[PDB]
Amino acid sequence: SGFRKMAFPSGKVEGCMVQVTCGTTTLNGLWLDDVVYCPRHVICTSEDMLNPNYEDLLIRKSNHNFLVQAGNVQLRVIGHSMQNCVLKLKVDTANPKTPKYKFVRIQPGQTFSVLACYNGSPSGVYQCAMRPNFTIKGSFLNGSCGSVGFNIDYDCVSFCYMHHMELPTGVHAGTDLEGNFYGPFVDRQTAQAAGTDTTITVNVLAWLYAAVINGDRWFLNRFTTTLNDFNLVAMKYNYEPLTQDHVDILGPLSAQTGIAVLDMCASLKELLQNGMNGRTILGSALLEDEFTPFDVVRQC
Amino acid sequence: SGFRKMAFPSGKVEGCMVQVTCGTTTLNGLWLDDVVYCPRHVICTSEDMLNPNYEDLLIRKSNHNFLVQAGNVQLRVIGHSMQNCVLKLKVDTANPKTPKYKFVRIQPGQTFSVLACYNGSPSGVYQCAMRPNFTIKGSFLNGSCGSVGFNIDYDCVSFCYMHHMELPTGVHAGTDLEGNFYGPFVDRQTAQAAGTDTTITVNVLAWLYAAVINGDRWFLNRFTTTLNDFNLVAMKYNYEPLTQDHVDILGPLSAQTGIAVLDMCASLKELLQNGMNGRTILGSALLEDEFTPFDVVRQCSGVTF
Ligand SMILES: O=C1[C@H](c2cccc(Cl)c2)CCCN1c1cncc2ccccc12
Numbered sequence: 001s002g003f004r005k006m007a008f009p010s011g012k013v014e015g016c017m018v019q020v021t022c023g024t025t026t027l028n029g030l031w032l033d034d035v036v037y038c039p040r041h042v043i044c045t046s047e048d049m050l051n052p053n054y055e056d057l058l059i060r061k062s063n064h065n066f067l068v069q070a071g072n073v074q075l076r077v078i079g080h081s082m083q084n085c086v087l088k089l090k091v092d093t094a095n096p097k098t099p100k101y102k103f104v105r106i107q108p109g110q111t112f113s114v115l116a117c118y119n120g121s122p123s124g125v126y127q128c129a130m131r132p133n134f135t136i137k138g139s140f141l142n143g144s145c146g147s148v149g150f151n152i153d154y155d156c157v158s159f160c161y162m163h164h165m166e167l168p169t170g171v172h173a174g175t176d177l178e179g180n181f182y183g184p185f186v187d188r189q190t191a192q193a194a195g196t197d198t199t200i201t202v203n204v205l206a207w208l209y210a211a212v213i214n215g216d217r218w219f220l221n222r223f224t225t226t227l228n229d230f231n232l233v234a235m236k237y238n239y240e241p242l243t244q245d246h247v248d249i250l251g252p253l254s255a256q257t258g259i260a261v262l263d264m265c266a267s268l269k270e271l272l273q274n275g276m277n278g279r280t281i282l283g284s285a286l287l288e289d290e291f292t293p294f295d296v297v298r299q300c
Numbered sequence: 301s302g303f304r305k306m307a308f309p310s311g312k313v314e315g316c317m318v319q320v321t322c323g324t325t326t327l328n329g330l331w332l333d334d335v336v337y338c339p340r341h342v343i344c345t346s347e348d349m350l351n352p353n354y355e356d357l358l359i360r361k362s363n364h365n366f367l368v369q370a371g372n373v374q375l376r377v378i379g380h381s382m383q384n385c386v387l388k389l390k391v392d393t394a395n396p397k398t399p400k401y402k403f404v405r406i407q408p409g410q411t412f413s414v415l416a417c418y419n420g421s422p423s424g425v426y427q428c429a430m431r432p433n434f435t436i437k438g439s440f441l442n443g444s445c446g447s448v449g450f451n452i453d454y455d456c457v458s459f460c461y462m463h464h465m466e467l468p469t470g471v472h473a474g475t476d477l478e479g480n481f482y483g484p485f486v487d488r489q490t491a492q493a494a495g496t497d498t499t500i501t502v503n504v505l506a507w508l509y510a511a512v513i514n515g516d517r518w519f520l521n522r523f524t525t526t527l528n529d530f531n532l533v534a535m536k537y538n539y540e541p542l543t544q545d546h547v548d549i550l551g552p553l554s555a556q557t558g559i560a561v562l563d564m565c566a567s568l569k570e571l572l573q574n575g576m577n578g579r580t581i582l583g584s585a586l587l588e589d590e591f592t593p594f595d596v597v598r599q600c601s602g603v604t605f
């Protein structure tokens with residue numbers, strides 16, 4: 001019993017964190033096999049950030065301009081290339097601690113663990129979700145760039161995020177490990193803002209099924225709803241539309257608890273209307289949206 | 301910016317997790333140097349748990365009755381002894397991945413990271429606090445026994461908790477690594493319950509300082525309070541007493557934000573007496589008490605391990 005916001009064990013990723021320095025700029029890199037991946041803005045000064053021409057800034061760099069440190073050992077850069085917004089630094093040593101891994105691009109609503117790092121050294125691990133507005137509500141200070149997001153389902157680390165920037169509202173933006181940003185963001189100090197964020201409806205429903213599995217039923221009601229009526233109501237509370245895909249994904253949880261997906265949608269509608277009236281659901285006074293249907297099945 | 305419930309990186313502990321099997325019971329063990337530590341109830345059947353005589357159950361076991369698996373390698377048990385509620389299995393191989401470590405007993409209010417394991421394999425990591433009633437609000441299923449709690453101070457892992465049991469309210473009880481239970485719990489299947497819990501006041505204050513550091517100031521006010529008046533209000537709302545030690549520990553956070561500790565106490569008093577009025581603090585409608593002052597400083601300064 002119990003339901004916690006749980007991150008994947010970070011050991012497999014800790015053994016990949018390195019420090020990357022280019023001139024006065026220092027950030028984190030992910031060392032997998034003989035390549036170190038890091039945000040391309042490591043080649044920029046603060047002045048370069050307004051309108052950087054990365055191709056032009058990079059052509060002026062040689063391999064020895066990049067200093068890569070793995071623990072107390074300096075790795076030798078023997079090649080460099082740019083792929084979208086990530087810089088790939090070929091090194092002369094393959095990481096002996098390279099786990100079984102893949103690069104995966106996630107969709108909004110997906111969760112992942114973040115291993116926050118500074119100077120190539122891991123500081124902490126926490127659980128995140130890719131928000132519908134493509135930002136993540138992280139905990140990142142200056143120097144955290146290059147920290148990564150991942151999932152570890154069955155011994156294989158799936159890297160899904162690399163941290164690049166903090167937006168004005170204190171939320172965070174980054175790329176997949178191929179260097180493509182999540183969201184309409186760019187690695188430029190231009191006016192950028194997070195779009196209006198919404199609640200990940202399918203995740204709130206998953207969490208309500210987690211609460212039922214753990215013995216709580218106070219929020220259930222005798223009502224059901226159509227999918228369209230639910231969406232009309234939910235959008236008024238800034239909730240993401242629930243699609244037929246989401247209803248299908250919640251099938252296993254619906255079968256386990258005996259509560260049909262549209263019956264749980266009716267409880268959610270009522271919770272949005274009434275609030276909790278001094279009660280809690282899994283130790284929370286707010287509806288939690290950073291647990292996916294998959295995370296619920298994994299934990300419960 | 302941002303403030304998350306953050307655990308310590310678990311890699312140093314993952315390299316110590318092993319599976320321990322005694323008869324039909326399988327649980328987790330912590331392999332440090334040539335010893336595997338695990339709950340002593342691994343030698344019990346469900347019937348034994350009703351009224352176990354651990355010394356008597358253990359004397360009937362030989363080394364080969366304990367099967368210890370580290371990954372896909374079977375370790376050979378060459379000795380066994382009991383220390384309080386922890387079984388120590390001497391093995392013929394020292395763990396090459398043994399980090400610099402210590403065994404520490406924590407106080408209620410102190411937080412730690414739990415690496416939840418099943419069959420000697422780490423499944424997840426989360427942060428939690430030792431409640432004032434000595435339970436932890438963990439997330440553990442059958443098979444999680446032997447999972448450990450820890451903190452990291454520089455490059456040293458301080459093991460502070462080993463999982464043993466779940467109480468009827470779904471909360472958890474365990475021991476330090478010397479096998480001493482936190483709380484008035486016993487490793488026996490008998491009527492046991494968590495006592496009435498209280499809120500960790502110093503931790504709520506630390507979290508309120510974290511909210512101020514992150515730009516959330518709506519709860520600040522012009523008022524201050526005495527420590528004694530604050531403690532009368534704390535007692536009324538099932539909050540732990542705030543001591544002068546707690547006030548001292550919050551000094552650095554008070555200096556950084558410019559809000560005196562007793563000035564933050566007046567915010568907390570107002571929050572307890574009036575609620576949040578539809579507002580949230582760091583994305584929470586409840587006052588969070590599972591971040592110590594040290595946790596707040598560490599996360600807001602970027603301390604690494
Ligand atoms: O956002 C940025 C800067 C930036 C500016 C524009 C585009 C890009 Cl891709 C990056 C570069 C320096 C690091 N940085 C930060 C990244 N994460 C957390 C931060 C917390 C506080 C202060 C800066 C933070």
Ligand SMILES: O=C1[C@H](c2cccc(Cl)c2)CCCN1c1cncc2ccccc12
Nearest residue numbers: 001341440441442464465466486487488489
């Ligand atoms: O509490 C116990 C049992 C127990 C009974 C009496 C004393 C002692 Cl020390 C242990 C033994 C089996 C494992 N166990 C559990 C431990 N954690 C989470 C559990 C979730 C569901 C079911 C059992 C759980």
Ligand SMILES: [Cl-]
Nearest residue numbers: 105106107110
């Ligand atoms: Cl996805």
Ligand SMILES: [Cl-]
Nearest residue numbers: 352353354355
């Ligand atoms: Cl006994």
Ligand SMILES: [Cl-]
Nearest residue numbers: 571575576587
């Ligand atoms: Cl409150």
